Paper text:
Peroxisome proliferator-activated receptor gamma (PPARγ) is a nuclear receptor (NR) transcription factor that regulates gene programs that influence cellular differentiation, metabolism, adipogenesis, and insulin sensitization. NRs are modular domain transcription factors with an N-terminal disordered activation domain (NTD) containing the activation function-1 (AF-1) region, a central DNA-binding domain (DBD), and a C-terminal ligand-binding domain (LBD) containing the activation function-2 (AF-2) coregulator interaction surface. The general mechanism of NR-mediated gene expression occurs via recruitment of transcriptional corepressor and coactivator protein complexes, which bind to the AF-1 in a ligand-independent manner and the AF-2 surface in a ligand-dependent manner. , In the absence of ligand, PPARγ recruits corepressor proteins resulting in repression of gene expression, which is then activated upon binding an agonist ligand. Hyperactivation of peroxisome proliferator-activated receptor γ-mediated transcription promotes tumor growth in urothelial (bladder) cancer, which can be inhibited by compounds that repress PPARγ activity.
FX-909 is a covalent PPARγ inverse agonist in phase 1 clinical trials for advanced solid malignancies, including muscle-invasive bladder cancer. To gain insight into the structural basis of FX-909 inverse agonism, we incubated PPARγ LBD with FX-909 followed by addition of the NCoR1 corepressor peptide and crystallized the complex, which represents a transcriptionally repressive conformation. We solved a crystal structure of PPARγ LBD bound to FX-909 and the NCoR1 corepressor peptide to 2.1 Å resolution. In the repressive PPARγ LBD conformation bound to FX-909 and the NCoR1 peptide, helix 12 adopts a solvent occluded conformation within the orthosteric binding pocket. Several noncovalent polar interactions likely contribute to stabilizing helix 12 including S342 on β-sheet 2 with D472 on helix 12; R280 on helix 3 with N470 on helix 12; and R288 on helix 3 with E471, D475, and L476 on helix 12. The covalent ligands bind to PPARγ via a halogen exchange mechanism resulting in a covalent bond formed between the substituted phenyl group and the thiol group of residue C285, which points into and positions the ligands within the orthosteric ligand-binding pocket. The FX-909 nitrile group off the substituted phenyl group, near the site of covalent modification with C285 on helix 3, makes a noncovalent polar interaction with the terminal amine side chain of residue K367 (3.04Å) and a weaker interaction (3.72Å) to the thioester side chain of M364 on helix 7. In all covalent ligand-bound repressive conformation structures, the amide side chain group of PPARγ residue Q286 on helix 3 makes a polar interaction with a carbonyl group on the ligand, which in FX-909 is off the 5,7-difluoroquinolinone group and in the other ligands comprises the benzamide group.
Residue numbers in the entry:
A (entry chain D): 2260 to 2272
B (entry chain B): 203 to 261, 275 to 477
The structure:
Protein backbone atom coordinates (compact mmCIF):
# COMPACT_ATOMS: atom_id res chain seq x y z
CA UNK A 1 0.00 0.00 0.00
CA UNK A 2 2.87 2.36 0.75
CA UNK A 3 4.34 1.49 -2.63
CA UNK A 4 0.84 1.75 -4.10
CA UNK A 5 0.23 5.28 -2.78
CA UNK A 6 3.70 6.09 -4.09
CA UNK A 7 2.76 4.97 -7.61
CA UNK A 8 -0.45 7.03 -7.37
CA UNK A 9 1.32 10.19 -6.22
CA UNK A 10 3.79 10.02 -9.11
CA UNK A 11 0.94 9.50 -11.58
CA UNK A 12 -1.10 12.50 -10.34
CA UNK A 13 1.85 14.78 -11.12
CA UNK B 1 -37.20 15.04 -21.47
CA UNK B 2 -34.49 16.19 -23.93
CA UNK B 3 -33.49 19.51 -22.40
CA UNK B 4 -30.30 21.37 -21.39
CA UNK B 5 -29.94 19.45 -18.11
CA UNK B 6 -30.24 16.07 -19.88
CA UNK B 7 -27.99 17.17 -22.75
CA UNK B 8 -25.29 18.08 -20.22
CA UNK B 9 -25.66 14.66 -18.59
CA UNK B 10 -25.19 13.13 -22.02
CA UNK B 11 -22.26 15.44 -22.63
CA UNK B 12 -20.59 14.21 -19.44
CA UNK B 13 -21.20 10.56 -20.40
CA UNK B 14 -19.51 11.22 -23.76
CA UNK B 15 -16.54 13.05 -22.25
CA UNK B 16 -16.07 10.20 -19.78
CA UNK B 17 -16.37 7.54 -22.52
CA UNK B 18 -13.78 9.21 -24.76
CA UNK B 19 -11.38 9.63 -21.83
CA UNK B 20 -12.00 5.99 -20.86
CA UNK B 21 -11.01 4.94 -24.39
CA UNK B 22 -7.78 6.96 -24.29
CA UNK B 23 -6.72 5.71 -20.83
CA UNK B 24 -7.62 1.99 -21.15
CA UNK B 25 -6.34 0.23 -24.32
CA UNK B 26 -7.95 -3.20 -23.67
CA UNK B 27 -11.69 -2.52 -23.94
CA UNK B 28 -14.27 -4.99 -22.71
CA UNK B 29 -15.28 -5.49 -26.36
CA UNK B 30 -11.74 -6.52 -27.32
CA UNK B 31 -11.74 -8.90 -24.34
CA UNK B 32 -15.17 -10.40 -25.07
CA UNK B 33 -14.13 -10.88 -28.69
CA UNK B 34 -11.35 -13.25 -27.60
CA UNK B 35 -13.37 -15.31 -25.13
CA UNK B 36 -16.11 -16.08 -27.66
CA UNK B 37 -13.58 -17.26 -30.18
CA UNK B 38 -13.91 -14.47 -32.73
CA UNK B 39 -10.13 -13.93 -33.11
CA UNK B 40 -8.52 -16.20 -35.69
CA UNK B 41 -5.07 -14.52 -35.53
CA UNK B 42 -2.98 -16.33 -32.85
CA UNK B 43 -5.99 -17.72 -30.98
CA UNK B 44 -5.40 -18.15 -27.24
CA UNK B 45 -4.07 -21.50 -26.02
CA UNK B 46 -6.10 -23.30 -23.34
CA UNK B 47 -4.49 -24.48 -20.11
CA UNK B 48 -6.88 -26.94 -18.49
CA UNK B 49 -4.60 -29.34 -16.55
CA UNK B 50 -1.03 -30.26 -15.61
CA UNK B 51 -0.12 -31.87 -18.92
CA UNK B 52 -1.42 -28.86 -20.85
CA UNK B 53 0.48 -26.57 -18.46
CA UNK B 54 3.82 -28.03 -19.58
CA UNK B 55 2.80 -27.78 -23.24
CA UNK B 56 1.92 -24.11 -22.83
CA UNK B 57 5.38 -23.45 -21.42
CA UNK B 58 6.68 -21.85 -24.61
CA UNK B 59 4.31 -18.87 -24.07
CA UNK B 60 10.29 -15.47 -0.26
CA UNK B 61 7.05 -17.34 0.47
CA UNK B 62 5.40 -18.42 -2.80
CA UNK B 63 2.21 -16.53 -1.95
CA UNK B 64 3.99 -13.27 -1.07
CA UNK B 65 5.93 -13.49 -4.32
CA UNK B 66 2.82 -14.09 -6.42
CA UNK B 67 1.27 -11.01 -4.83
CA UNK B 68 4.34 -8.84 -5.40
CA UNK B 69 4.50 -9.95 -9.03
CA UNK B 70 0.86 -9.11 -9.66
CA UNK B 71 1.19 -5.69 -8.04
CA UNK B 72 4.17 -4.93 -10.27
CA UNK B 73 2.24 -6.05 -13.34
CA UNK B 74 -0.62 -3.81 -12.10
CA UNK B 75 1.46 -0.62 -12.04
CA UNK B 76 0.37 0.25 -15.58
CA UNK B 77 -3.22 -0.41 -14.53
CA UNK B 78 -2.91 1.93 -11.54
CA UNK B 79 -1.35 4.62 -13.76
CA UNK B 80 -4.16 4.43 -16.37
CA UNK B 81 -6.82 4.71 -13.68
CA UNK B 82 -5.12 7.76 -12.20
CA UNK B 83 -5.06 9.21 -15.73
CA UNK B 84 -8.74 8.39 -16.13
CA UNK B 85 -9.50 10.02 -12.78
CA UNK B 86 -7.71 13.23 -13.75
CA UNK B 87 -10.23 13.57 -16.61
CA UNK B 88 -13.26 13.40 -14.27
CA UNK B 89 -14.43 17.05 -14.00
CA UNK B 90 -13.61 18.43 -10.54
CA UNK B 91 -11.25 15.64 -9.50
CA UNK B 92 -7.93 17.52 -9.86
CA UNK B 93 -9.47 20.36 -7.84
CA UNK B 94 -9.99 18.12 -4.79
CA UNK B 95 -7.47 18.08 -1.92
CA UNK B 96 -4.38 16.27 -3.20
CA UNK B 97 -4.44 14.10 -0.08
CA UNK B 98 -8.03 13.11 -0.87
CA UNK B 99 -7.26 12.35 -4.52
CA UNK B 100 -4.74 9.78 -3.23
CA UNK B 101 -7.19 8.21 -0.76
CA UNK B 102 -9.91 7.93 -3.44
CA UNK B 103 -7.45 6.23 -5.78
CA UNK B 104 -5.71 4.14 -3.11
CA UNK B 105 -9.04 2.41 -2.40
CA UNK B 106 -10.60 2.66 -5.88
CA UNK B 107 -7.89 0.82 -7.84
CA UNK B 108 -8.48 -2.70 -6.46
CA UNK B 109 -12.25 -2.49 -7.05
CA UNK B 110 -11.67 -1.17 -10.58
CA UNK B 111 -9.10 -3.89 -11.40
CA UNK B 112 -11.63 -6.52 -10.33
CA UNK B 113 -14.19 -4.87 -12.60
CA UNK B 114 -11.80 -5.14 -15.55
CA UNK B 115 -10.80 -8.66 -14.53
CA UNK B 116 -14.44 -9.70 -14.92
CA UNK B 117 -14.05 -8.72 -18.57
CA UNK B 118 -11.41 -11.48 -18.88
CA UNK B 119 -13.57 -14.15 -17.28
CA UNK B 120 -16.38 -16.29 -18.47
CA UNK B 121 -17.74 -19.35 -16.71
CA UNK B 122 -15.02 -21.58 -18.25
CA UNK B 123 -11.92 -19.62 -17.24
CA UNK B 124 -9.97 -16.43 -17.68
CA UNK B 125 -7.65 -14.86 -20.23
CA UNK B 126 -3.95 -14.61 -19.36
CA UNK B 127 -0.63 -13.54 -20.93
CA UNK B 128 -2.06 -10.43 -22.61
CA UNK B 129 -4.71 -12.69 -24.14
CA UNK B 130 -2.43 -15.47 -25.43
CA UNK B 131 -3.66 -17.95 -22.80
CA UNK B 132 -6.92 -19.17 -21.30
CA UNK B 133 -6.69 -20.73 -17.83
CA UNK B 134 -9.68 -22.77 -16.83
CA UNK B 135 -11.73 -22.08 -13.72
CA UNK B 136 -11.85 -25.74 -12.73
CA UNK B 137 -8.07 -26.17 -13.08
CA UNK B 138 -7.57 -23.19 -10.76
CA UNK B 139 -10.10 -24.52 -8.24
CA UNK B 140 -8.37 -27.91 -8.42
CA UNK B 141 -5.01 -26.58 -7.23
CA UNK B 142 -3.82 -27.43 -3.72
CA UNK B 143 -4.78 -25.41 -0.69
CA UNK B 144 -4.64 -22.50 -0.35
CA UNK B 145 -4.17 -21.64 -4.06
CA UNK B 146 -7.29 -23.61 -5.03
CA UNK B 147 -9.54 -20.96 -3.44
CA UNK B 148 -7.73 -17.88 -4.81
CA UNK B 149 -9.82 -17.19 -7.88
CA UNK B 150 -13.13 -18.97 -7.39
CA UNK B 151 -14.90 -16.13 -5.51
CA UNK B 152 -13.90 -13.82 -8.36
CA UNK B 153 -15.39 -16.12 -11.02
CA UNK B 154 -18.69 -16.23 -9.14
CA UNK B 155 -18.78 -12.43 -8.97
CA UNK B 156 -17.67 -12.08 -12.60
CA UNK B 157 -20.39 -14.30 -14.04
CA UNK B 158 -23.19 -12.29 -12.45
CA UNK B 159 -21.62 -8.95 -13.36
CA UNK B 160 -21.04 -10.03 -16.96
CA UNK B 161 -24.64 -11.27 -17.21
CA UNK B 162 -25.84 -7.66 -16.87
CA UNK B 163 -24.29 -6.99 -20.31
CA UNK B 164 -22.71 -3.61 -19.63
CA UNK B 165 -20.61 -2.16 -22.43
CA UNK B 166 -17.62 0.17 -22.38
CA UNK B 167 -19.90 3.23 -22.32
CA UNK B 168 -21.66 1.92 -19.22
CA UNK B 169 -18.42 0.91 -17.51
CA UNK B 170 -16.80 4.34 -17.95
CA UNK B 171 -19.43 6.13 -15.83
CA UNK B 172 -19.64 3.17 -13.44
CA UNK B 173 -15.87 3.37 -12.83
CA UNK B 174 -16.13 7.14 -12.31
CA UNK B 175 -18.81 6.50 -9.64
CA UNK B 176 -16.40 4.06 -7.95
CA UNK B 177 -13.50 6.52 -7.78
CA UNK B 178 -15.57 9.38 -6.38
CA UNK B 179 -16.84 7.32 -3.39
CA UNK B 180 -17.39 9.59 -0.41
CA UNK B 181 -17.13 6.87 2.24
CA UNK B 182 -13.42 6.01 2.02
CA UNK B 183 -11.54 6.09 5.35
CA UNK B 184 -9.32 9.11 5.85
CA UNK B 185 -11.24 11.53 3.63
CA UNK B 186 -11.10 15.19 4.71
CA UNK B 187 -13.58 17.06 2.49
CA UNK B 188 -16.45 14.72 1.74
CA UNK B 189 -18.93 17.29 0.37
CA UNK B 190 -16.98 18.19 -2.82
CA UNK B 191 -16.46 14.47 -3.58
CA UNK B 192 -20.15 13.73 -3.12
CA UNK B 193 -21.20 16.71 -5.25
CA UNK B 194 -19.15 15.21 -8.11
CA UNK B 195 -20.52 11.73 -7.48
CA UNK B 196 -24.15 12.93 -7.34
CA UNK B 197 -23.74 14.42 -10.80
CA UNK B 198 -22.03 11.22 -12.00
CA UNK B 199 -24.95 9.18 -10.69
CA UNK B 200 -27.46 11.35 -12.55
CA UNK B 201 -25.47 10.66 -15.73
CA UNK B 202 -25.23 6.94 -14.91
CA UNK B 203 -29.01 6.70 -14.34
CA UNK B 204 -29.76 8.33 -17.70
CA UNK B 205 -27.15 6.23 -19.53
CA UNK B 206 -28.71 3.01 -18.20
CA UNK B 207 -32.23 4.13 -19.20
CA UNK B 208 -31.19 4.85 -22.79
CA UNK B 209 -28.92 1.81 -23.07
CA UNK B 210 -30.71 -0.97 -21.14
CA UNK B 211 -34.46 -1.18 -21.72
CA UNK B 212 -34.56 -4.82 -20.58
CA UNK B 213 -33.72 -3.97 -16.92
CA UNK B 214 -35.93 -1.67 -14.83
CA UNK B 215 -33.77 -1.91 -11.66
CA UNK B 216 -30.32 -2.16 -13.34
CA UNK B 217 -29.31 1.14 -11.72
CA UNK B 218 -29.99 -0.43 -8.30
CA UNK B 219 -28.38 -3.75 -9.24
CA UNK B 220 -25.23 -2.04 -10.53
CA UNK B 221 -24.79 -0.05 -7.31
CA UNK B 222 -25.22 -3.30 -5.38
CA UNK B 223 -22.30 -4.66 -7.38
CA UNK B 224 -20.13 -2.06 -5.64
CA UNK B 225 -20.85 -3.82 -2.37
CA UNK B 226 -19.68 -7.07 -3.93
CA UNK B 227 -16.47 -5.54 -5.28
CA UNK B 228 -15.48 -4.35 -1.81
CA UNK B 229 -16.13 -7.86 -0.53
CA UNK B 230 -13.56 -9.44 -2.85
CA UNK B 231 -11.13 -6.78 -1.68
CA UNK B 232 -11.80 -7.68 1.96
CA UNK B 233 -11.56 -11.35 1.04
CA UNK B 234 -7.93 -10.77 0.04
CA UNK B 235 -7.14 -9.62 3.60
CA UNK B 236 -8.56 -12.87 4.97
CA UNK B 237 -6.55 -14.67 2.31
CA UNK B 238 -3.35 -13.26 3.80
CA UNK B 239 -4.32 -14.60 7.24
CA UNK B 240 -5.08 -18.01 5.74
CA UNK B 241 -1.55 -17.81 4.25
CA UNK B 242 0.09 -16.98 7.59
CA UNK B 243 -1.59 -19.85 9.44
CA UNK B 244 -0.89 -22.33 6.63
CA UNK B 245 2.07 -24.60 7.27
CA UNK B 246 1.13 -27.30 4.77
CA UNK B 247 3.42 -27.47 1.74
CA UNK B 248 2.91 -24.19 -0.13
CA UNK B 249 4.69 -25.64 -3.18
CA UNK B 250 3.33 -24.62 -6.60
CA UNK B 251 4.63 -25.18 -10.14
CA UNK B 252 6.68 -22.16 -11.29
CA UNK B 253 4.41 -21.96 -14.36
CA UNK B 254 1.40 -21.65 -12.09
CA UNK B 255 3.09 -18.87 -10.13
CA UNK B 256 3.59 -17.00 -13.41
CA UNK B 257 -0.04 -17.56 -14.33
CA UNK B 258 -1.07 -16.32 -10.89
CA UNK B 259 1.09 -13.21 -11.26
CA UNK B 260 -1.25 -12.48 -14.22
CA UNK B 261 -4.37 -12.42 -12.05
CA UNK B 262 -5.52 -10.36 -9.07
C1 LIG C 1 -2.24 -10.69 -7.32
C2 LIG C 1 -2.22 -11.87 -8.05
C3 LIG C 1 -3.09 -12.91 -7.73
C4 LIG C 1 -3.96 -12.75 -6.66
C5 LIG C 1 -4.96 -13.79 -6.18
N1 LIG C 1 -5.70 -14.55 -5.82
C6 LIG C 1 -3.96 -11.59 -5.94
C7 LIG C 1 -3.11 -10.58 -6.26
C8 LIG C 1 -3.31 -9.37 -5.37
C9 LIG C 1 -2.30 -8.69 -4.74
C10 LIG C 1 -2.60 -7.53 -3.90
O1 LIG C 1 -1.54 -6.88 -3.28
C11 LIG C 1 -4.03 -7.10 -3.71
C12 LIG C 1 -4.40 -6.00 -2.89
F1 LIG C 1 -3.45 -5.28 -2.25
C13 LIG C 1 -5.74 -5.64 -2.75
C14 LIG C 1 -6.67 -6.40 -3.41
F2 LIG C 1 -7.98 -6.07 -3.27
C15 LIG C 1 -6.37 -7.45 -4.19
C16 LIG C 1 -5.07 -7.81 -4.35
N2 LIG C 1 -4.72 -8.99 -5.20
Amino acid sequence: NLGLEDIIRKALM
Amino acid sequence: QLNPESADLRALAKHLYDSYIKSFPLTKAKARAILTGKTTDKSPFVIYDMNSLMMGEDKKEVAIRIFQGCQFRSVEAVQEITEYAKSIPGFVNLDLNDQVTLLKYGVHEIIYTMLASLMNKDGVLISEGQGFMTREFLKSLRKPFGDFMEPKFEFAVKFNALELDDSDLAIFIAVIILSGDRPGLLNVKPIEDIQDNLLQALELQLKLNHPESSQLFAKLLQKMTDLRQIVTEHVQLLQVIKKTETDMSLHPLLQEIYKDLY
